[PDB]
Design an enzyme around this catalytic site. Structure first.
Site, short mmCIF file in Angstrom:
data_model
loop_
_atom_site.label_atom_id
_atom_site.label_comp_id
_atom_site.label_asym_id
_atom_site.label_seq_id
_atom_site.Cartn_x
_atom_site.Cartn_y
_atom_site.Cartn_z
N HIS A 129 0.84 -1.23 0.00
CA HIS A 129 0.00 0.00 0.00
C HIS A 129 0.87 1.27 0.00
N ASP A 152 12.59 21.39 -25.20
CA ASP A 152 12.40 20.10 -24.50
C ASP A 152 13.28 20.12 -23.25
N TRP A 161 7.02 -0.48 5.31
CA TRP A 161 7.72 0.16 4.16
C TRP A 161 9.12 0.64 4.57
N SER A 210 15.73 5.66 -11.45
CA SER A 210 14.75 6.43 -12.25
C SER A 210 14.73 7.89 -11.76
N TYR A 245 9.14 15.59 2.25
CA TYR A 245 9.20 16.98 1.75
C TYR A 245 9.20 16.92 0.22
N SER A 257 0.30 27.22 -5.27
CA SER A 257 0.67 28.64 -5.55
C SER A 257 0.06 29.04 -6.92
N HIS A 269 12.11 10.21 13.91
CA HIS A 269 11.48 8.89 13.61
C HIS A 269 12.03 7.80 14.55
C1 HEA Z 1 3.96 14.94 2.74
C2 HEA Z 1 4.15 14.19 3.80
C3 HEA Z 1 4.49 14.75 5.12
C4 HEA Z 1 4.68 16.14 5.52
C5 HEA Z 1 4.55 17.39 4.69
C6 HEA Z 1 5.01 15.98 6.96
C7 HEA Z 1 5.28 17.14 7.84
C8 HEA Z 1 5.75 17.11 9.23
N1 HEA Z 1 5.88 15.99 9.95
FE1 HEA Z 1 5.49 14.02 9.35
N2 HEA Z 1 5.34 12.08 8.67
C9 HEA Z 1 5.01 11.66 7.46
C10 HEA Z 1 4.68 12.54 6.37
C11 HEA Z 1 4.75 13.99 6.34
N3 HEA Z 1 5.04 14.70 7.41
C12 HEA Z 1 4.98 10.20 7.26
C13 HEA Z 1 4.64 9.39 6.05
C14 HEA Z 1 5.38 9.71 8.57
C15 HEA Z 1 5.49 8.28 9.02
C16 HEA Z 1 6.79 7.56 8.75
C17 HEA Z 1 6.44 6.19 9.19
O1 HEA Z 1 5.77 5.43 8.35
O2 HEA Z 1 6.68 5.82 10.32
C18 HEA Z 1 5.54 10.95 9.37
C19 HEA Z 1 6.00 10.90 10.76
C20 HEA Z 1 6.40 12.05 11.59
C21 HEA Z 1 7.00 11.87 12.91
C22 HEA Z 1 7.31 10.59 13.63
C23 HEA Z 1 6.22 10.20 14.61
C24 HEA Z 1 6.47 8.81 15.12
O3 HEA Z 1 6.76 7.85 14.22
O4 HEA Z 1 6.38 8.61 16.34
C25 HEA Z 1 7.19 13.24 13.33
C26 HEA Z 1 7.85 13.75 14.56
O5 HEA Z 1 8.26 14.91 14.62
C27 HEA Z 1 6.70 14.05 12.21
C28 HEA Z 1 6.75 15.53 12.22
C29 HEA Z 1 6.39 16.41 11.11
C30 HEA Z 1 6.58 17.85 11.22
C31 HEA Z 1 7.09 18.62 12.38
C32 HEA Z 1 6.15 18.35 9.93
C33 HEA Z 1 6.13 19.75 9.44
O6 HEA Z 1 6.71 19.76 8.13
C34 HEA Z 1 4.71 20.31 9.42
C35 HEA Z 1 4.74 21.82 9.34
C36 HEA Z 1 3.37 22.48 9.09
C37 HEA Z 1 2.70 23.21 9.99
C38 HEA Z 1 3.18 23.45 11.39
C39 HEA Z 1 1.39 23.80 9.59
C40 HEA Z 1 1.63 25.09 8.81
C41 HEA Z 1 2.24 26.15 9.68
C42 HEA Z 1 1.60 27.19 10.25
C43 HEA Z 1 0.14 27.51 10.08
C44 HEA Z 1 2.46 28.11 11.09
C45 HEA Z 1 2.00 28.23 12.53
C46 HEA Z 1 2.24 26.96 13.33
C47 HEA Z 1 2.88 26.91 14.53
C48 HEA Z 1 3.51 28.10 15.19
C49 HEA Z 1 2.99 25.59 15.25
N4 HEA Z 1 6.23 13.32 11.20
C1 HEA Z 2 0.69 9.02 -0.68
C2 HEA Z 2 0.73 8.03 0.16
C3 HEA Z 2 -0.49 7.43 0.70
C4 HEA Z 2 -1.89 7.67 0.35
C5 HEA Z 2 -2.47 8.54 -0.72
C6 HEA Z 2 -2.59 6.81 1.31
C7 HEA Z 2 -4.04 6.66 1.28
C8 HEA Z 2 -4.88 5.82 2.13
N1 HEA Z 2 -4.34 5.07 3.11
FE1 HEA Z 2 -2.35 4.82 3.69
N2 HEA Z 2 -0.38 4.63 4.29
C9 HEA Z 2 0.71 5.15 3.68
C10 HEA Z 2 0.69 5.99 2.48
C11 HEA Z 2 -0.51 6.48 1.81
N3 HEA Z 2 -1.78 6.14 2.16
C12 HEA Z 2 1.98 4.82 4.34
C13 HEA Z 2 3.37 5.22 3.98
C14 HEA Z 2 1.55 3.98 5.46
C15 HEA Z 2 2.40 3.34 6.51
C16 HEA Z 2 2.68 1.93 6.00
C17 HEA Z 2 3.38 1.07 7.04
O1 HEA Z 2 3.00 1.14 8.33
O2 HEA Z 2 4.30 0.33 6.66
C18 HEA Z 2 0.11 3.92 5.31
C19 HEA Z 2 -0.69 3.23 6.31
C20 HEA Z 2 -2.13 3.12 6.31
C21 HEA Z 2 -2.83 2.43 7.40
C22 HEA Z 2 -2.27 1.79 8.62
C23 HEA Z 2 -1.91 0.36 8.41
C24 HEA Z 2 -1.62 -0.27 9.74
O3 HEA Z 2 -0.90 0.42 10.64
O4 HEA Z 2 -2.05 -1.42 9.94
C25 HEA Z 2 -4.21 2.56 6.94
C26 HEA Z 2 -5.43 2.13 7.66
O5 HEA Z 2 -6.49 2.72 7.46
C27 HEA Z 2 -4.15 3.31 5.68
C28 HEA Z 2 -5.33 3.66 4.88
C29 HEA Z 2 -5.41 4.52 3.70
C30 HEA Z 2 -6.73 4.86 3.10
C31 HEA Z 2 -8.10 4.39 3.48
C32 HEA Z 2 -6.38 5.76 2.02
C33 HEA Z 2 -7.39 6.38 1.13
O6 HEA Z 2 -7.41 7.78 1.33
C34 HEA Z 2 -7.08 6.08 -0.31
C35 HEA Z 2 -8.05 6.82 -1.22
C36 HEA Z 2 -7.51 6.78 -2.64
C37 HEA Z 2 -6.76 7.78 -3.12
C38 HEA Z 2 -6.45 8.96 -2.27
C39 HEA Z 2 -6.18 7.68 -4.51
C40 HEA Z 2 -6.83 8.71 -5.40
C41 HEA Z 2 -5.88 9.25 -6.45
C42 HEA Z 2 -5.60 8.56 -7.56
C43 HEA Z 2 -6.19 7.21 -7.84
C44 HEA Z 2 -4.70 9.15 -8.58
C45 HEA Z 2 -5.53 9.48 -9.82
C46 HEA Z 2 -4.69 10.43 -10.63
C47 HEA Z 2 -4.92 10.82 -11.89
C48 HEA Z 2 -6.08 10.37 -12.72
C49 HEA Z 2 -3.94 11.77 -12.49
N4 HEA Z 2 -2.90 3.63 5.33
CU LIG Z 3 10.16 12.97 9.44
O LIG Z 4 8.66 12.46 8.46
O LIG Z 5 7.13 13.96 8.86
#
Ligand code: HEA
Ligand code: HEA
Ligand SMILES: [Cu+2]
Ligand SMILES: [O-]
Ligand SMILES: [O]
Ligand SMILES: CCCCCCCCCCCCCCCCCC(=O)OCC(COC(=O)CCCCCCCCCCCCCCCCC)OC(=O)CCCCCCCCCCCCCCCCC
Ligand SMILES: CCCCC/C=C\C/C=C\C/C=C\C/C=C\CCCC(=O)O[C@H](COC(=O)CCCCCCCCCCCCCCCCC)COP(=O)(O)OCCN
Ligand SMILES: CCCCC/C=C\C/C=C\C/C=C\C/C=C\CCCC(=O)O[C@H](COC(=O)CCCCCCCCCCCCCCCCC)COP(=O)(O)OCCN
Ligand SMILES: CCCCCC/C=C\CCCCCCCCCC(=O)O[C@H](COC(=O)CCCCCCCCCCCCCCC)COP(=O)(O)OC[C@@H](O)CO
Ligand SMILES: CCCCCC/C=C\CCCCCCCCCC(=O)O[C@H](COC(=O)CCCCCCCCCCCCCCC)COP(=O)(O)OC[C@@H](O)CO
Ligand SMILES: CCCCCC/C=C\CCCCCCCCCC(=O)O[C@H](COC(=O)CCCCCCCCCCCCCCC)COP(=O)(O)OC[C@@H](O)CO
Ligand SMILES: CCCCCCCCCCO[C@@H]1O[C@H](CO)[C@@H](O[C@H]2O[C@H](CO)[C@@H](O)[C@H](O)[C@H]2O)[C@H](O)[C@H]1O
Ligand SMILES: CCCCCCCCCCO[C@@H]1O[C@H](CO)[C@@H](O[C@H]2O[C@H](CO)[C@@H](O)[C@H](O)[C@H]2O)[C@H](O)[C@H]1O
Ligand SMILES: C[C@H](CCC(=O)O)[C@H]1CC[C@H]2[C@@H]3[C@H](O)C[C@@H]4C[C@H](O)CC[C@]4(C)[C@H]3C[C@H](O)[C@]12C
Ligand SMILES: C[C@H](CCC(=O)O)[C@H]1CC[C@H]2[C@@H]3[C@H](O)C[C@@H]4C[C@H](O)CC[C@]4(C)[C@H]3C[C@H](O)[C@]12C
Ligand SMILES: C[C@H](CCC(=O)O)[C@H]1CC[C@H]2[C@@H]3[C@H](O)C[C@@H]4C[C@H](O)CC[C@]4(C)[C@H]3C[C@H](O)[C@]12C
Ligand SMILES: C[C@H](CCC(=O)O)[C@H]1CC[C@H]2[C@@H]3[C@H](O)C[C@@H]4C[C@H](O)CC[C@]4(C)[C@H]3C[C@H](O)[C@]12C
Ligand code: CUA
Ligand SMILES: [Mg+2]
Ligand code: NA
Ligand SMILES: [Zn+2]
Lengths: 84, 58, 514, 46, 43, 78, 227, 96, 259
Positions: free
Chosen positions: C61, C91, C126, C156, C244, C255, C291
């Site tokens: 997934h 291009d 993953w 890639s 990021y 934007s 993490h």
């Molecule tokens: C696009 C994907 C995406 C993005 C953008 C982010 C953004 C952030 N993430 Fe997240 N994160 C994930 C995807 C993402 N993360 C995923 C996939 C995992 C799981 C990995 C795994 O599978 O275990 C994860 C896990 C993860 C952990 C680990 C938790 C754990 O495993 O126990 C933490 C801990 O700090 C974290 C922090 C943050 C922070 C601080 C930001 C910041 O970038 C967010 C900043 C944004 C804002 C704060 C809002 C906008 C700001 C304002 C409106 C300003 C005013 C706000 C304040 C003054 C507070 N993330």
């Molecule tokens: C981009 C990354 C991504 C996206 C979109 C999603 C989408 C969803 N995810 Fe997932 N998820 C992960 C990345 C993502 N996830 C990761 C990294 C983990 C952790 C894995 C791990 O623990 O190892 C996770 C884990 C995770 C768990 C926890 C598993 C567990 O701990 O047992 C669950 C349970 O509900 C879940 C559910 C869903 C559901 C219901 C959606 C639904 O929102 C899905 C709905 C469908 C869409 C949003 C797709 C629509 C868009 C398109 C089809 C593209 C079409 C485009 C064109 C035509 C140009 N996800």
């Molecule tokens: Cu992180």
């Molecule tokens: O992260």
């Molecule tokens: O994150």
């Protein structure tokens, strides 16, 4: 530093050829002298069957699966100690 | 050796509508058809191997 | 012709089109894997069997959604289509290498699919942490096939990154400075830089995992003096920059969309938006151990990673406020794309704020490896990345196709998806504080209600995915050809018509140095 | 030279809307079905 | 954005057909597999 | 010098990783027990190290390090 | 444990988990402040016919919305870090227990005086006695003295596990070849449930933790009864 | 020193040679250089070479503007930037 | 007709055959490691070389023979190559990280020391020092090669380039020799793992760089390079300096300090 040599008058091809033949290759010659003059079959080390060495979590996919790829029997024991 | 670079410029700039990978004659075409054959063959073979490994054997 | 055009392409628009088709298909694979997750958890007990086949599904997934859906659509699809049209380039710098970026991905996908067919598949998560990913707990070819899939995808994206950086630097109009390129182009150049520096460290890590499994190395095996924690460092050194990477192209699209549908000629605080993206790129390389707040690191390290993780909010905040300031005094067009962009602005903010909760090592003890973390990242991915993708897609579909979508249908789709993703992920915050772990096929009885609502939410999202396929069909079946486009004086990509010809800018733009 | 304009810059034909429906169906359908068949396959070995 | 009318307009009836075929292409195979889950497990 | 409840705080090992604390006190014991047999002396001066290592070290680690001392494959310098 | 329809944290059983509750409240207050402010300002921007589509000058308001956020992060970082360094504090414990993760069960070693050790397996659902909790009960609970500082040491003998008890504010990963320390202090007696918090194979969902916190006297006799 | 290494003068071919020759005669047929602006008034317009009837003009109206104004310039009377009103006139062709 | 200086590339089948050859090599390793069989690996290796050969052949056809490498195109290739080297720096960094991780914190299981109990390290003042002098010398000779080319001197360019390649080959034979003579293996725990994987990747890089200089040699023989346009040689020279610098870090870190 500035090494200790002298030049910097011009960095053209003559100067780099002078460094190739006057310094670079002579260094190779000395280090080749010093090397083939300090090594002549090193007294092979005693086999203790330590557990953090001769690791075998899975057979190698060549030979009998128990020999590393540049296995040298004179210096590399199997996990059960040396062969011939 | 001799500078035949001008000979090759003439040959590779000839306006015969061939793409660059075929523009050096019969050999280019042989090497191309061998490459493409080993690739397509090797791919069918890998899908067969994948099929074979997806099932257990006792 | 077909073969020359579609298998042997050196055209940025056609390669872009290949990326969008692949991403869309992968997206279907990921949706089905996400319903299997929620089918299993929709009532108490066991649907499939043990946590092994469940976590095969959970692992696949993530890999499908991240590497085969989000990155190909946003970087490969939008990036190849739009970057040359926005900088007046004929291009990409390396159009033949650009084709190989595309053709590496289907093999990459075939290997990952093969990994779930052979043996018991890769039920690793993953993150693929050893020793579970090692040659005892995962004997046989499943994890090896997974490592090789990740290699082909990393190659890639590295080749793609070298192409995008070289193109944006070397192929602008001579008079055009970098500070005169649109924010989508900035977003892709910085993503490409993160890919170039991050993916080779992943490649090193998973290579060391391959050798531990097959050449009797002990990089990660304590028996040999190895350390499973080393793998976590290497992985997360890539892994945090990867999230990021996943959102920056989306910041760029947002934007553009908010500017266009406000009828503004440019976004508020252009140089502040460049500053914020560079700051996010840089800060995202020095935070990885957030993490790893439960592995047993020194308290002073845990204090550093907490503090450093939190600073990212400042530049991110500048972007959020700038988007709202761009709306200010706008002639607002309530287009489908505009709805996607506003949903993004609010929902990404919520997911970022829960990210800030998790930044606290003290609190992360209790929230780590619970559904609180799952909720955070689905807010920023299902309702950030995916919202930007839908917004970009309905905005620019007429540019790519020459045809219009049915706007009413597009709005019905947004409404269904908005309910679905919020009903799926909002309750998961509760599951997490209340201490329901990640990667569980079944849960204690107390957790039943929130898991039932969440699972129901996921079925509403399915209805939206199905309606989208129909909406695309309707557009190609009806054939409403584009006539006229607004605001072309500040949107160069539209200026060669819909769709643009095969060769654009055979004669480059004219721009004076003044 | 390659063909230009709406319905011509895509590797699939949009000339006939029902043949198109049939293609899109096999396409998106084959993708959505695959994980269900993979899960069925794992249950039928173990 | 402005556009010509549909060159090959899609009637309500034609949309109903297309939406139906779209949905059944997602639901029928999944449903088959999911419906027969226990026949697989009993193995 | 006793009334032992459990291994106290040791400022040499102030962090969550306590692997080295188990390891040091196990070497420290078997080193002391060796020197008190090789110089005919009191083996129970070494007793504190044994108490701390038995408290902190998993059974399976102690088992393994002991079998290896017997076998002459123990990697630590005693 | 968790109870049905729970929204927030399990009630605290230790001073640390209490201190975490108050910190989460602080943080969440701010999260509501910011998320609500953004929602208001969105609807503000979208509810007027009045336009201003010409250039707007940035470096005045750009100052406000850099500096305020920074102060807010200091208001979160200060309490966050006080708590962090308080969870590592020099302890002076009375007891040292070891837990060792395995596929798929926990073993526990009390080796201060005697070589006491035992395996701790989940009660299968079919063997539960009426009123016993599906997936949460173990056969051999971890008995520990209440109102005493205990050193818990966590390792594994195979793959990664994670030893978690939410109620006491504890999660420490179990890594083979490594000894991770945490400190455990119950303010009250009772039963306190946790579950394996790191993916560890087939039965990751089915290897839980139960603490039985009782007075020292009862702890003493239990230990003896268990050799 | 021997010779034996050809020069660009001797051995450069196709478009590389074309760019090289054209450069020596102070000319830029392949738009490698930024064209220099005139006063851009009705009587002194910016002269925009094109090998066809129309060419896209990007106008950076004020120095350090981050947004370029894009429009098609056609064969005929001078046209103006929609934003700052400077004047551009399409002049011909030939180039290659 | 185009009035820009950029290269619109003919449709090419090599991207596809490279992609497919990548599938055959990764399938092939899987078949080797698990089903003891090399067939698929052999085919993938073959299709890989045939692809690298025809792709880079066409680049020479496009540049030397068709004159598409305008100064604009040439700027792009410079950037592309610096970017590729940077990505390789980050790859090696993972191996340096792994080494420093293990060596600065030796676990109990090694005896809590570096080097581990039972490991007999090579002397860094023997062949390691000779390897160092061979590569540093080859950096001087390739610089002479470059200046000879720029000054138009065919004979000295070829002479300097020949010495450069000979020194590359010498280093490879000395290292093969050291591998065979060595009293530890890749299976001798984390010392063996870090040693053979770091040095072994570097060695593979020495072979790729040597091959590249040899391609440069044959191209010079056939008068492809002008005194002003020779990017193929510049790229080979930058790659060679990279291989050199990586060896110095290996020598200091693994051979000297971690012994
Ligand atoms: C696009 C994907 C995406 C993005 C953008 C982010 C953004 C952030 N993430 Fe997240 N994160 C994930 C995807 C993402 N993360 C995923 C996939 C995992 C799981 C990995 C795994 O599978 O275990 C994860 C896990 C993860 C952990 C680990 C938790 C754990 O495993 O126990 C933490 C801990 O700090 C974290 C922090 C943050 C922070 C601080 C930001 C910041 O970038 C967010 C900043 C944004 C804002 C704060 C809002 C906008 C700001 C304002 C409106 C300003 C005013 C706000 C304040 C003054 C507070 N993330
Ligand atoms: C981009 C990354 C991504 C996206 C979109 C999603 C989408 C969803 N995810 Fe997932 N998820 C992960 C990345 C993502 N996830 C990761 C990294 C983990 C952790 C894995 C791990 O623990 O190892 C996770 C884990 C995770 C768990 C926890 C598993 C567990 O701990 O047992 C669950 C349970 O509900 C879940 C559910 C869903 C559901 C219901 C959606 C639904 O929102 C899905 C709905 C469908 C869409 C949003 C797709 C629509 C868009 C398109 C089809 C593209 C079409 C485009 C064109 C035509 C140009 N996800
Ligand atoms: Cu992180
Ligand atoms: O992260
Ligand atoms: O994150
Ligand atoms: C807006 C989102 C998308 C919109 C679409 C619809 C869906 C979205 C939902 C969206 C509706 C929001 C409802 C707020 C939740 C109230 C719970 C609470 O008081 O939370 C308290 C705590 C801890 O709880 C406790 O320890 C004490 C609780 C006392 C319980 C005793 C009695 C129980 C009462 C019964 C409640 C039944 C449950 C009902 C809960 C509902 C179940 C679905 O829980 C938590 O931390 C959970 C917090 C999760 C963090 C996510 C950030 C949310 C901010 C963004 C939302 C917009 C707001 C902007 C400003 C406000 C404007 C919105
Ligand atoms: C544990 C110890 C810790 C100590 C830490 C302390 C310091 C660290 C060390 C170094 C860093 C110090 C400071 C760096 C700051 C700035 C340096 C500024 C130099 C600079 O920028 O100067 C430029 C470059 O200099 C150049 O490369 C240099 C040009 C040199 C020209 C004159 C050299 C004459 C010297 C004798 C020649 C020797 C012969 C060499 C060849 C043989 C090889 C052995 C000038 O270029 P230019 O005018 O175009 O010349 C063109 C003429 N051909
Ligand atoms: C002169 C030095 C250069 C040698 C080149 C010639 C032939 C050797 C073959 C392959 C080497 C290529 C790549 C390096 C990979 C792994 C490290 C191997 C280094 C090496 O050669 O080390 C040897 C181990 O080889 C072994 O067993 C292993 C034997 C090789 C097995 C093949 C490994 C293939 C898998 C590698 C993964 C590739 C993924 C890369 C990712 C691409 C980018 C994303 C050392 O010999 P030993 O007997 O253990 O100890 C010496 C005893 N006296
Ligand atoms: C077993 C483990 C899995 C292994 C997977 C291997 C993956 C693929 C194998 C097949 C690849 C070999 C085929 C040769 C590739 C040639 C790349 C190249 O040479 O591309 C060049 C540009 O990139 C440049 O310069 C500089 C860039 C040079 C890139 C090097 C290409 C090799 C790819 C390897 C990438 C490894 C990344 C290292 C980090 C992991 C040329 O650009 P084109 O668009 O062609 O044309 C442009 C025209 O103007 C030229 O006339
Ligand atoms: C690069 C140029 C700028 C300079 C960089 C300086 C910053 C970091 C590198 C130097 C830091 C070494 C400091 C060593 C001092 C302590 C020794 C030590 O032992 O640290 C060890 C980790 O070092 C390790 O691998 C460290 C491994 C390195 C990890 C950092 C990765 C950065 C990579 C990106 C750089 C790209 C640029 C390329 C440069 C050409 C382990 O930690 P301990 O906690 O001891 O474990 C035992 C516990 O039980 C004790 O409580
Ligand atoms: C068991 C053994 C297995 C080993 C398998 C690998 C073996 C060999 C690979 C060897 C590398 C050879 C590359 C040669 C490229 C030749 C084409 C070329 O050099 O093309 C040149 C441009 O460079 C360009 O595109 C730039 C070309 C850049 C190529 C550099 C990339 C090196 C790639 C290495 C990738 C592997 C990395 C390791 C990962 C495991 C042409 O321009 P000029 O020279 O200016 O000429 C023009 C003048 O004539 C005009 O008058
Ligand atoms: C990123 C690039 C990746 C490149 C990966 C390169 C592929 C690895 C090359 C493997 O080379 C082969 O290794 C075999 C090892 O199996 C050798 O024979 C082996 O086979 C015999 C029996 O199986 C033994 O008796 C021999 O001693 C033993 O060396 C065989 O000669 C050699 O060609
Ligand atoms: C998350 C994705 C899942 C979405 C939910 C899918 C909704 C189900 C719609 C399509 O499902 C069909 O339902 C029938 C059951 O009504 C099944 O026939 C089965 O059931 C009938 C008896 O009830 C028999 O007549 C049939 O022969 C027998 O194969 C049939 O195979 C299945 O395709
Ligand atoms: C142009 C086309 C490539 C098709 C593709 O890429 O799918 C050609 C090039 C070389 C051709 C192959 C070889 O020339 C000859 C092979 C023998 C038979 O003629 C058919 C199969 C055979 C294996 C061919 C299949 C196909 O016609 C190929 C692969
Ligand atoms: C996490 C990493 C070690 C990786 C490994 O164990 O292999 C280490 C190596 C260098 C460390 C950093 C340096 O020691 C410098 C800083 C020291 C402070 O006490 C903590 C933050 C600080 C910035 C450290 C954080 C972290 O512990 C780093 C980055
Ligand atoms: C000076 C520079 C670019 C100016 C230009 O050439 O256009 C601008 C662009 C964005 C600006 C920054 C951003 O506006 C964010 C910050 C805003 C604060 O008011 C000052 C510091 C602050 C960090 C700014 C410093 C500086 O004025 C920056 C960095
Ligand atoms: C053949 C060529 C002369 C120029 C020409 O081809 O017209 C000469 C000039 C430089 C020569 C090479 C260089 O001098 C380097 C080598 C010198 C040694 O004497 C061995 C032959 C050696 C490998 C030479 C082979 C060949 O005779 C070369 C290549
Ligand atoms: Cu043990 Cu999960
Ligand atoms: Mg965890
Ligand atoms: Na379930
Ligand atoms: Zn203007």
């Amino acid at each position: 530093a500035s090494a200790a040599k002298g030049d910097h008058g011009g960095t053209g091809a003559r100067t780099w050829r002078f460094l190739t033949f006057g310094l670079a290759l002579p260094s190779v010659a000395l280090c080749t002298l010093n090397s083939w003059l300090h090594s002549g079959h090193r007294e092979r080390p005693a086999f203790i069957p330590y557990h953090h060495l001769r690791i075998r979590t899975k057979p190698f996919s060549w030979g009998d699966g128990n020999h590393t790829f540049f296995h040298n029997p004179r210096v590399n024991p199997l996990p059960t100690g040396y062969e011939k | 050796f001799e500078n035949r670079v001008a000979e090759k410029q003439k040959l590779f700039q000839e306006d015969n509508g061939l793409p660059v990978h075929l523009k050096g004659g019969a050999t280019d075409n042989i090497l191309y058809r061998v490459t493409m054959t080993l690739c397509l063959g090797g791919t069918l073979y890998s899908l067969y191997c994948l099929g074979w490994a997806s099932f257990p054997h006792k | 012709m077909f073969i020359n055009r579609w298998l042997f392409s050196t055209n940025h628009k056609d390669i872009g089109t290949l990326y969008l088709l692949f991403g869309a298909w992968a997206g279907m694979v990921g949706t089905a894997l996400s319903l299997l997750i929620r089918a299993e958890l929709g009532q108490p007990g066991t649907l499939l069997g043990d946590d092994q086949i469940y976590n095969v599904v959970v692992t696949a997934h993530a890999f499908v959604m991240i590497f085969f859906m989000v990155m190909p659509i946003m970087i490969g699809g939008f990036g190849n289509w739009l970057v040359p049209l926005m900088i007046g380039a004929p291009d990409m710098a390396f159009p033949r290498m650009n084709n190989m970026s595309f053709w590496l991905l289907p093999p990459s996908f075939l290997l990952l699919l093969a990994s779930s067919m052979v043996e018991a598949g890769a039920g690793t998560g993953w993150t693929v942490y050893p020793p579970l990913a090692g040659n005892l707990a995962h004997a046989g070819a499943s994890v090896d096939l997974t490592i090789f899939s990740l290699h082909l995808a990393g190659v890639s994206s590295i080749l793609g990154a070298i192409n995008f950086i070289t193109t944006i630097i070397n192929m602008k109009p001579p008079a055009m400075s970098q500070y005169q390129t649109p924010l989508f182009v900035w977003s892709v150049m910085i993503t490409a830089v993160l890919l170039l520096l991050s993916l080779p460290v992943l490649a090193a890590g998973i290579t060391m995992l391959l050798t531990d499994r097959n050449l009797n190395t002990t990089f990660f095996d304590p028996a040999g003096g190895g350390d499973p924690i080393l793998y976590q460092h290497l992985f997360w050194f890539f892994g945090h920059p990867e999230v990021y990477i996943l959102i920056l192209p989306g910041f760029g699209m947002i934007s553009h969309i908010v500017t266009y549908y406000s009828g503004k000629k440019e976004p508020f605080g252009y140089m502040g938006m460049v500053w914020a993206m560079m700051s996010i790129g840089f800060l995202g390389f020095i935070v990885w151990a957030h993490h790893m707040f439960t592995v047993g690191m020194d308290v002073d390290t845990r204090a550093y990673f907490t503090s450093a993780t939190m600073i990212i909010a400042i530049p991110t905040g500048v972007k959020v406020f700038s988007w709202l300031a761009t709306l200010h005094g706008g002639n607002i067009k309530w287009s489908p794309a505009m709805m996607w962009a506003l949903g993004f602005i609010f929902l990404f903010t919520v997911g970022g704020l829960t990210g800030i909760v998790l930044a606290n090592s003290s609190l992360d003890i209790v929230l780590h490896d619970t559904y609180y973390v799952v909720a955070h990242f689905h807010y920023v991915l299902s309702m950030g990345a995916v919202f930007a993708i839908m917004g970009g897609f309905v905005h620019w579909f007429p540019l790519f196709s020459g045809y219009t979508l049915n706007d009413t249908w597009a709005k019905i789709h947004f409404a269904i998806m908005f309910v679905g993703v919020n009903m799926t992920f909002f309750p998961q915050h509760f599951l997490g504080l209340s201490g329901m772990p990640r990667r569980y096929s079944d849960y204690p009885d107390a957790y039943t209600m929130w898991n039932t609502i969440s699972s129901m939410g996921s079925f509403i999202s399915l209805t939206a995915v199905m309606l989208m396929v129909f909406i695309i069909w309707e557009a190609f079946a009806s054939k409403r050809e584009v006539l006229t486009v607004d605001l072309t004086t500040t949107n160069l990509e539209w200026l060669n018509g819909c769709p643009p010809p095969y060769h654009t800018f055979e004669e480059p733009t004219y721009v004076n140095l003044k | 030279h390659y063909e230009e304009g709406p319905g011509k810059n895509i590797p699939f034909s949009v000339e006939n809307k029902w043949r198109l429906l049939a293609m899109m169906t096999l396409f998106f359908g084959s993708g959505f079905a695959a994980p269900f068949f993979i899960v069925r396959h794992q249950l039928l070995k173990k | 954005i402005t556009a010509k009318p549909a060159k090959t307009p899609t009637s309500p009836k034609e949309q109903a057909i297309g939406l139906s075929v779209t949905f059944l292409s997602f639901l029928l195979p999944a449903g088959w597999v999911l419906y027969h889950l226990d026949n697989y497990k009993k193995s | 010098i006793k009334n032992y409840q459990t291994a106290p705080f040791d400022s040499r090992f102030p962090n969550q990783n306590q692997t080295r604390n188990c390891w040091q006190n196990y070497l420290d014991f078997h080193r002391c027990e060796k020197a008190m047999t090789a110089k005919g002396g009191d083996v129970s001066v070494c007793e504190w190290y044994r108490r701390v290592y038995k408290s902190l070290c998993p059974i399976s680690w102690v088992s393994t390090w002991d079998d290896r001392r017997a076998e002459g494959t123990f990697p630590g310098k005693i | 444990m968790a109870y049905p329809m729970q929204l927030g944290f399990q009630d605290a059983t230790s001073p640390i988990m209490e201190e975490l509750l108050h910190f989460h409240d602080h943080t969440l207050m701010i999260v509501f402040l910011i998320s609500s402010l953004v929602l208001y300002i969105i609807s503000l921007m979208l509810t007027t016919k009045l336009t201003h589509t010409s250039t707007m000058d940035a470096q005045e308001v750009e100052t406000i919305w850099t500096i305020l956020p920074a102060i807010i992060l200091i208001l979160i970082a200060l309490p966050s870090l006080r708590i962090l360094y308080m969870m590592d504090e020099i302890n002076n414990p009375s007891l040292t227990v070891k837990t060792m993760g395995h596929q798929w069960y926990w073993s526990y070693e009390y080796t201060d005086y005697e070589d006491l050790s035992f395996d701790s397996y989940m009660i299968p659902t079919s063997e539960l006695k009426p009123g016993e909790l599906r997936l949460l009960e173990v056969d051999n609970r971890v008995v520990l003295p209440m109102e005493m500082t205990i050193r818990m040491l966590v390792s594994s003998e195979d793959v990664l596990h994670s030893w978690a008890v939410p109620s006491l504010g504890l999660k420490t990963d179990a890594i083979p070849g490594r000894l991770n320390q945490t400190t455990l202090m119950s303010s009250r007696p009772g039963l306190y449930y946790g579950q394996c918090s790191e993916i560890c194979g087939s039965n990751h969902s089915f290897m839980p933790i139960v603490l039985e916190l009782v007075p020292l006297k009862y702890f003493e006799k239990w230990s003896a009864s268990m050799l | 020193s021997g010779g034996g290494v050809p020069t660009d003068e001797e051995q450069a071919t196709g478009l590389e040679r074309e760019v090289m020759l054209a450069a020596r005669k102070g000319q830029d047929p392949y738009n490698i250089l930024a064209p220099k602006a005139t006063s851009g008034t009705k009587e002194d317009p910016n002269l925009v070479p094109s090998i066809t009837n129309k060419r896209i003009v990007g106008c950076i109206c004020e120095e350090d503007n981050s947004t370029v104004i894009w429009f098609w310039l056609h064969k005929g009377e001078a046209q103006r930037c929609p934003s700052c009103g400077t004047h551009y006139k399409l002049v011909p062709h030939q180039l290659a | 007709h185009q009035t820009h200086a950029y290269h619109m590339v003919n449709p090419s089948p090599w991207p596809l055959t490279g992609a497919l050859s990548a599938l055959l090599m990764t399938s092939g390793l899987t078949m080797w490691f698990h089903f003891n069989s090399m067939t698929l690996l052999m085919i993938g290796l073959t299709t890989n070389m045939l692809t690298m050969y025809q792709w880079w052949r066409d680049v020479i056809r496009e540049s030397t023979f068709q004159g598409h490498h305008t100064p604009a195109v040439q700027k792009g290739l410079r950037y592309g190559m610096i970017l590729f080297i940077i990505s390789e720096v980050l790859f090696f960094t993972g191996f340096f990280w792994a080494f420093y991780h293990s060596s600065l914190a030796p676990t109990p299981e090694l005896g809590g020391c570096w080097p581990p109990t039972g490991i007999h390290p090579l002397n860094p003042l023997e062949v390691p020092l000779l390897n160092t002098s061979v590569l540093l010398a080859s950096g001087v000779s390739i610089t002479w090669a470059h200046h000879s080319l720029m000054e138009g001197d065919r004979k000295h360019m070829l002479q300097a380039l020949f010495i450069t390649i000979t020194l590359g080959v010498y280093f490879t034979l000395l290292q093969a020799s050291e591998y065979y003579e060595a009293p530890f293996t890749i299976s001798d725990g984390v010392y063996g793992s870090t040693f053979f994987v770091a040095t072994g990747f570097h060695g593979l890089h020495v072979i790729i760089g040597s091959t590249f200089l040899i391609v440069c040699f044959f191209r010079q023989l056939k008068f492809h390079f002008t005194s002003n346009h020779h990017f193929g040689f510049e790229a080979a020279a930058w790659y060679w300096h990279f291989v050199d610098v990586v060896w110095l870090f290996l020598y200091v870190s693994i051979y000297w300090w971690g012994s």
